[PDB]
Design a protein around this ligand. Structure first.
Ligand SMILES: *Cc1c(COP(=O)(O)O)cnc(C)c1O
Ligand SMILES: *Cc1c(COP(=O)(O)O)cnc(C)c1O
Ligand SMILES: *Cc1c(COP(=O)(O)O)cnc(C)c1O
Lengths: 521, 521, 60, 60, 521
């Protein structure tokens, strides 16, 4: 039903915006950080010129490699001759920050950026461009952790976006065996369709273990539920924080527990957390915070900076993590097997960090020395980082919040105004609940009547028919309530209002029944 | 020996340039196509502005989605207001060509490019951006084939560079079974270390079948040798055309045969050709030319436009190819198995083209709707294409040739001048042969003496010690001759001359022996 | 207006045509993006078009 | 014309496309409103369009 | 049939491009020399200003006559203040060439150009503007002849394009009698419809004498065939070199003969050659080369510089030509008759050169002093000349060749690739021959079958229906072969490919018969 449902929905779905929602169960931000973008293009312009001025013959199209000697001077010149353009003003301060706050080799930093943007050299090292790692890692440990982690202790792996991040991690786990067929994997829920399908594969054949989030308590995980990880046969924990579709962060309670469990009875536990919707939130602590040595942090630059198309992400991983210990508590058999595989990599294959493998794994080892993320991408990603690292007021972060609050307001204008503001909700997604809506519009009486008179599916098609907008279903309840999951980041004021105009148009069609069919009594 | 050799070589190797050669057995071009690069940055600048002018609130950093209505007009304006900059002059003509020669929707083309460069949307479709495919495919079928293939019949898959292209193809073959463990794979040789290591894996366990190239006949494959594919148990042919390290294209004879074999006794044959060094050559016909339905063409934008760092490549594949037929001549068992895998993709899993799978395979299916190459990259790649499609005189191509001829000249200035110009050699790599060198310097007499007095390994270290330059060994002979493989595309005039200054410094140390040790006779 | 009054007279001006008007407004906007007023005069057009969803041209 | 000749060759130029031509003519006009000739070259367009009532684009 | 054919073709023909082909049996170049064009407009701008600065009253619209005194200085100033614009850079060098290579009065040259472009004075002399003649004549004698002719010996007549050139020459011949009703006129063939219709008029009533070009020998005229001119009653020879539709130049053999015939047994012979497609060719010798005193050379600037609309052409004619001798070997009767006609022209009407009459004839004598080509046109034509006279590398000429080769390539991509490159073919037009095509696609077998199964007419309509493109028929064979004449200079890459897509779509419809109707055997 929910597979032939989506079927005929597409049949009407007007857009791409709504088509991705429908196909990937995610909303694609109709906004984007432009300043770092301009800085990028502007940086290329300077780079382009460095290059032409390194190609020694009189030929127009060609250009050579940017020299490193004297490069600050030049970058400095370029900066002063363009201080007028919105992008170069920022492209300059970055240099400060990389130099005066991170204290890194300015020249080094520049030349990596310049050469990096001309994408004329293979990513050396493959894992991630030297300074880009020290910079971008700084972004992560601050937003995600901030608590304990000295950035100098985190390792990062540049990947083609969260998506790539997974297909790399899992496969990597299986290749090496830190994960054997038929293992127990804990999955914080509800989660969107895709992720609960990677384990449900043949090349994995693992078993589910839902860890239900209690709706009546704002989609938080219940103390009990989290205790399941106590079970020594559950090899790893899979979480998306903040959650998708719930759109909430794991409160201090939730964290504290895992912190304990892991610490008291499960130091063997592995954690794979996808903390993308992480940055939107005011204050936010990621599982990578509390259990730095037991977690694998996946951050995607795609939602926050509207940069889905760049496919930019990292796989964070402490330097002293279990994943590396576990590769030790392994039968001497497999070890010497792996040693045949990673034979081209180096002499002592038993020193190869996990993080470092994820890399080698990604392109069938033998090519390792040509694997990695495009130098331009690495650069853009860096620029997106410093843009976040230098926006001291959060004017950007504040701007988006309000952009949500507003889309929220507009949506619910004709449906009993907005819900109870949850301090742990990021609201990237909102839950239009038929019951709740009517209990605000007409009363406890009417409510119960329509909840049984209509279904989620009618909702989702009624809207996708009047407007053309796709709405996600309410996964993980008692299949007992028509609910609507709207994204507050993939549409415009006039469309959200249009959603409501329908939902409410329909909440009146019913009321006219409860009214007219009551008078027969 | 050749694994501990490289070991201590690195110990002295000065650079990255020489370090990649040493690690990936490939030379990284010290040059690059800049015009398309400038056009790119310039395009972003226009894009950046479209975006700011779509974000309706008064906030500085934010920007929205580029509208499509009226976009030519605007692009046109931008073009006229910058006709002075080297990049925008080209960024304009492109639009002509996309519109007046390919006859495609101009507006469509633009908006895909603009939105594409802002990487603010997921690659839709994942395989490759609609017009980008029609454009970039045009580049391929012309340089590679040109002969038969109507571009409208080729399919392309945007991948992170050849490298990705392989790790995708092989794995994809195994997932689906068009390749079963213990199959016979034909490998045109000599080839560089990496590729002969992908089959030598555990997740594959396949068997080698060298197809030796006859040195005495300019590294061409011998009629006989190619006949091995006649053997009905050799599932696929693996070639790199032009060859690496030989650096030659398969002459008309070589092609014609395969053309026949495939056509007469092996229509079941699969071909995987990596025709990157393809574009350098004056005229060039790729195996994808002669056997369009039996080949999988892998092209990498990295060598020709000096864009290694962008990681840009495609996996070309006819629409009516065996790979798709073969997925039919399969046991009804496996079929229904695959149907469980690709269950999220669509209803009829037996209609799914191979090309289309390579995609789904790449990110563990479930994410398919978020897989693909970054929209910026797709764009850059397109720009690199039209830059090649519109350089009617080849002034760029002519420019590089000469850049090789010169590096050649300089290298061999003190070693008996350059070799016999091979019309099928692309010279990206040159073979410094100790014997041949001395038979030009001193004579048949002296030659034979030193060839036995010195080894390849002494050569390679003598050079990497005096200069700091790494030189590849002469793989695939009778281990009977010190030879040196130099790349003519990864160093500068003064360094190549430096190589010679040593090789010759050493060819004199010997001559002073043959001279002084002769007088004892 | 001046570019709608078809005769060679300095003071006079005619009625603004509606056809092709976004393009033109757009041009004017880009050629003055420096002035504090036109920066806003532009975004307005967005808002009237992307949030209220009204006929941009009509609006202009 | 130069912006219709799709290859990278300096002397050559192609055929003027008709689609979107008012917009462009309009741009050219505004960027040269200073020159004695273009001021008139513009009004003409009015007259051909607002008094004779003919297809402006066609006319151009 | 071929008159009602064209009838219903138009009924479908989509364009003007194809409509002219269909109506004038000629292709209108979709390209054009712009540099001289810009120079022209730019020259007018300077001229415009000279004029305003010569009209002594305070009135805005008015302007006076350009003074000649001090004009180089001024032109020089204008040049330096605009050296940035692509047109003025060239507009300057021209002045050099007119002054330093032709050695003509610079000032004179300028003022003729300036005043010439303001078209404010009657063409004085009517025949052609003094310097314009010395310049433009230089263009002609070089491309056309180059061999013998000192430019100082050629006379030119400025006419409204070849077209005008004919209607002037013929009529002029008849007026004066160098051609009497019922004369024998030799016509090199095949030629396009129009020209074989001027003699077929009532005001002429002359008789045809085909001089067939041998297809099997690349449309060259056969030794025998050319000997017909030996016949002392054939008054004049009419040729179009290179030929239309064949598109070839008369090889060294062909020329040599006429050279002899004329020289040995026919010094009374007249030659009227239209050598327009002349300039496209690499090297080219025009009949005006070999028989300078017996030829009337007609050159049209329209094809080579894409300037059909300017209607620019000249009628070249030696100073010592037969046409003038013949006006002597005339009955004293007619002489005194003509003397009544050309009575206003001068005193001795028997001194009036033929060339000079063509002029007087063109506007019914009495107006002679107001006849001629527009001064602006004369100027543009001059600029087009110097643009050709100063493009020392032929970069323009090279550019078009390649533009043809490419259109060629694209056309034949799906029809057995391009034909045998004829060193005497200019390829302006290509001959798509059904037979030849299939003998390359499927084989001698199949060929013969379809050649009899299909007709030219089906070809031409099949294409003009699927695409909308008009294709000329194959005039002058044994009406025995469907052939298609395509122009490689009037369409774009995507359209030519479209032509093929059909021709081949149809060459398959047949093959599926030869295949399916063979299995009944
Ligand atoms: C959209 C989103 C991300 C981003 O994925 P990318 O490859 O990084 O595009 C990550 N995880 C979830 C749950 C998402 O909603
Ligand atoms: C360098 C080279 C290429 C380029 O690989 P990318 O991922 O495309 O960087 C491909 N194959 C061979 C044999 C090479 O020499
Ligand atoms: C097109 C062409 C010309 C040009 O004629 P104009 O008056 O000069 O336009 C001349 N002769 C032939 C055969 C042509 O093909």
């Amino acid at each position: 039903s929910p597979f032939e449902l989506k079927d005929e929905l597409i049949k009407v779905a007007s857009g791409k915006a709504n088509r991705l929602m429908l196909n990937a169960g995610r909303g694609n931000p109709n906004f984007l950080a432009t300043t770092p973008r301009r800085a990028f293009f502007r940086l290329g312009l300077f780079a382009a010129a460095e290059s032409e001025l390194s190609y020694s013959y009189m030929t127009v199209g060609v250009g050579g490699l940017a020299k490193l000697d004297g490069i600050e001077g030049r970058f400095e010149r370029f900066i002063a001759e363009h201080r007028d353009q919105e992008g170069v003003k920022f492209l300059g301060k970055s240099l400060s920050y990389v130099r005066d706050q991170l204290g890194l080799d300015p020249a080094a930093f520049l030349h990596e950026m310049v050469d990096g943007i001309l994408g004329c050299n293979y990513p050396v090292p493959p894992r991630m461009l030297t300074v880009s790692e020290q910079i971008v890692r700084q972004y992560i440990v601050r937003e995600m952790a901030g608590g304990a982690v000295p950035p100098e202790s985190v390792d990062l792996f540049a990947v083609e976006g969260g998506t790539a991040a997974m297909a790399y991690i899992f496969e990597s786990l299986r290749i090496s065996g830190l994960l054997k067929a038929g293992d127990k994997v804990a999955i914080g829920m509800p989660v969107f369709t895709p992720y609960i399908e990677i384990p449900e594969l043949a090349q994995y054949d693992l078993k589910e273990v839902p860890i239900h989030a209690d709706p009546d308590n704002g989609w938080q995980y219940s103390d009990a539920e989290l205790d399941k990880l106590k079970d020594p046969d559950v090899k790893i924990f899979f979480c998306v924080n903040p959650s998708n579709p719930p759109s909430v962060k794991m409160d201090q309670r939730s964290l504290d527990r895992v912190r304990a469990i892991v610490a008291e009875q499960r130091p063997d536990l592995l954690i794979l957390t996808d903390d993308v919707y992480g940055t939107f939130a005011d204050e936010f602590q990621s599982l990578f915070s509390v259990c730095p040595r037991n977690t694998l942090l996946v951050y995607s630059f795609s939602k926050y900076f509207g940069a889905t198309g760049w496919r930019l992400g990292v796989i964070a991983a402490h330097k002293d993590n279990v994943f590396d210990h576990a590769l030790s508590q392994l039968p001497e058999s497999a070890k010497k097997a792996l040693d045949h595989r990673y034979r081209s990599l180096l002499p002592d294959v038993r020193s190869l960090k996990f993080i470092d493998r994820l890399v080698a794994d990604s392109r069938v080892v033998a090519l390792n020395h040509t694997a990695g993320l495009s130098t331009p991408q690495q650069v853009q990603m860096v620029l997106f980082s410093l843009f976040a690292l230098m926006d001291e007021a959060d004017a950007y972060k504040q701007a988006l919040k309000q952009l949500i609050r507003r889309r929220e307001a507009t949506l619910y204008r004709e449906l009993g105004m907005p819900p109870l503001e949850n301090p742990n909700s990021v609201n990237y997604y909102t839950l239009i609940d038929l019951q709740n809506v009517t209990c605000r519009l007409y009363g406890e009486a009417f409510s119960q009547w329509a909840v049984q008179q209509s279904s989620t599916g009618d909702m989702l098609f009624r809207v996708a028919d009047e407007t053309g907008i796709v709405l996600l279903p309410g996964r993980g309840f008692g299949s007992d309530r028509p609910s609507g999951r709207a994204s507050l980041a993939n549409l415009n004021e006039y469309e959200y209002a249009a959603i409501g105009r329908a939902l409410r148009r329909l909440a009146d069609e019913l009321y006219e029944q409860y009214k007219a069919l009551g008078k027969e009594k």
